[PDB]
């Protein structure tokens, strides 16, 4: 896998 | 003629059950009046206690919906209390969901939308009540919004409801033609109540004792009803002028 700042 | 028994259209495009719900409005034979000040909104209603056995403190058609919103009802007390409990529930739920006090006009719209459903759904009858919502809104300032069994609602500079509504309406109309403004140019709410009572006396042609009237006042961040003694003080001021 997921996109994750 | 079963088109007169439920909320379906008559051949001439009318809803008789809605029209008859309006006639139920005047069953109590009580007249209400609402006006706006600079800082306040005042609502006055006739108080009639015919039975001597009644506890007069419990005989009221003015309800405290929220802490800023007040609501006077013209119609039978069972339907009045039905509308009151629902409005109280709706105002509380609004504050929980959206994190700010429900505005007077938004509650009015919500109750009007509920009233509209009763005119379109057959199993539910319309409530035989006209709801007059008053507050000092934090955005719009002094506010009067009135709902009826048709699901109609609108804002008012001032308004009147009941059997002798037309007489009170024209009395207020004539004042606003003269004053040339949308409100009662008065600093204190005490003098706005004195105006409301004075113009009801002139319109109906009847005098009032402390027990013949019921008064609700909306200020910034609270709506409250006056006691018999609060009204009596107010009636003395009118008489001494």
């Amino acid at each position: 896998x997921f996109l994750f700042x | 003629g079963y088109d007169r028994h439920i909320t379906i259209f008559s051949p001439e495009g009318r809803l008789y059950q809605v029209e008859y719900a309006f006639k139920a409005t005047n069953q109590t034979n009580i007249n209400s009046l609402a006006v706006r000040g600079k800082d306040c909104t005042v609502v006055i209603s006739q108080k009639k206690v015919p039975d001597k056995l009644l506890d007069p403190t419990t005989v009221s058609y003015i309800f405290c919906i929220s802490r800023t919103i007040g609501m006077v009802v013209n119609g039978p007390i069972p339907d009045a209390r039905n509308a009151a409990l629902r409005a109280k529930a709706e105002a509380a739920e609004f504050r929980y969901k959206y994190g700010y006090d429900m505005p007077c006009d938004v509650l009015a719209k919500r109750m009007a939308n509920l009233s509209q459903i009763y005119t379109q759904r057959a199993y539910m009858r319309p409530l035989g009540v006209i709801l007059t919502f008053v507050s000092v809104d934090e955005e719009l300032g002094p506010s009067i919004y009135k709902t009826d069994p048709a699901g109609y609602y609108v804002g008012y500079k001032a308004t009147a409801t009941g059997p002798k509504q037309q007489e009170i309406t024209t009395n207020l109309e004539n004042h606003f033609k003269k004053s040339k403004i949308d409100h009662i140019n008065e600093e204190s709410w005490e003098k706005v109540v004195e105006f409301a009572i004075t113009h009801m006396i002139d319109a109906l042609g009847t005098e009032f004792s402390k027990n013949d009237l019921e008064v609700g006042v909306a200020t910034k961040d609270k709506f409250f009803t006056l006691s018999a003694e609060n009204i009596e003080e107010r009636l003395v001021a009118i008489a001494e002028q």
């Binding site: - | 929220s66 802490r67 504050r95």
Partner: protein
């Protein structure tokens, strides 16, 4: 570290301002004293999320109660808190102290600990992540104490907790509930540390 103390004129609520994630202080100026009614307030310990959700619901119930039945008792507020904490004990980690002022009943303090039980006490102190202390200087507390004495008593008690503990810290916030109204007090570290 949170506590509520009943005194002559009403009741004082006090707490720290520190919110922790692991050893990181997420908020060093947290307001742990929450209004559920004009003169009914609560101290929140345990999960920040859980205590906020509960406090928001209790405030809704008391607002609705006030509309229908007028001003509610502190006991009523405590009952609503317990109901939410007891029925949802499996999914909740909230320790709450309820403090309120009635003109009839004066200052009342109720504690809802992790169990979801309710206890009415003259005063309550919870430290180290919702650990209520019995005793806690019972000789140091007397009934019908003065407002200044109560402020001094809570200020000292919380100061000692902050000193020994790392969970507690920042400023000391207090709320005074009396017939007069609501007063908010704040004490900065430089004042309370030299105690």
């Amino acid at each position: 570290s949170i506590m509520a103390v009943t005194f002559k004129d009403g009741v004082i609520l006090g707490a720290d301002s520190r919110t922790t994630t692991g050893a990181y202080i997420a908020n060093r100026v947290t307001d742990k004293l929450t209004r559920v009614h004009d003169k009914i307030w609560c101290c929140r310990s345990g999960s920040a999320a859980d205590t906020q959700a509960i406090a928001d619901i209790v405030q809704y119930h008391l607002e609705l109660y006030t509309s229908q039945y007028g001003t509610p008792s502190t006991e009523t507020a405590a009952s609503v808190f317990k109901e939410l904490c007891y029925e949802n004990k499996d999914n909740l980690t909230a320790g709450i102290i309820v403090a309120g002022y009635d003109d009839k009943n004066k200052g009342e303090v109720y504690t809802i600990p992790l169990g979801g039980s309710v206890h009415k006490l003259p005063y309550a102190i919870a430290v180290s992540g919702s650990t209520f202390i019995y005793g806690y200087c019972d000789k140091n507390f007397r009934e019908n104490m003065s407002k200044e004495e109560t402020v001094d008593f809570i200020k000292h008690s919380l100061s000692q907790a902050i000193k020994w503990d790392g969970s507690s810290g920042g400023v000391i916030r207090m709320v005074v509930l009396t017939a007069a109204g609501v007063e908010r007090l704040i004490f900065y570290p430089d004042e309370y540390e030299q105690l």
